[PDB]
Amino acid sequence: SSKPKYNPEVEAKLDVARRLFKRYDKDGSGQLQDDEIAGLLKDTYAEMGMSNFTPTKEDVKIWLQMADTNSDGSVSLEEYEDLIIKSLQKAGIRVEKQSLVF
């Protein structure tokens, strides 16, 4: 019903990641399979001026487990952005999410 409250510095990075998602999602399925992720990293890496290494079905697997919460070989829009959140924390971006006491 209600969504959390993230800082303006967080969404700022989540926006650029949103376009990159659909940029590869041609099937419009809303999930980046091990294949769709193969080339995705190549671009996602360019964001940091990286060499844009070309991994394989194996490497992509270890990367999928990080983003994907179900590790079902599919990273949803919400499952992908999160991957950048963990990095944004160390990158120098303050983020806050609605967390209550269990």
Q: Are 74 and 68 in contact (CB under 8 A)?
A: yes
- Report the distance separating Cα 67 and Cα 76, nearest Å: 9
CATH number of 84's domain: 1.10.238.10
Q: How was this structure determined?
A: NMR
Annotated binding-site members: 25, 27, 29, 31, 36, 68, 70, 72, 74, 79
- Report the distance separating Cα 44 and Cα 42, nearest Å: 6
Annotated binding-site members for Ca(2+): 25, 27, 29, 31, 36, 68, 70, 72, 74, 79
The total of structural domains in the chain comes to 1
- Report the distance separating Cα 10 and Cα 59, nearest Å: 27
Which contacts (CB < 8 Å, 24+ apart) does range 76-79 have?
76/30, 76/31, 77/18, 77/21, 77/30
Domain that holds residue 51: 1-102
CB-based burial label for 13 (10 Å; 0-12, 13-18, 19+)? middle
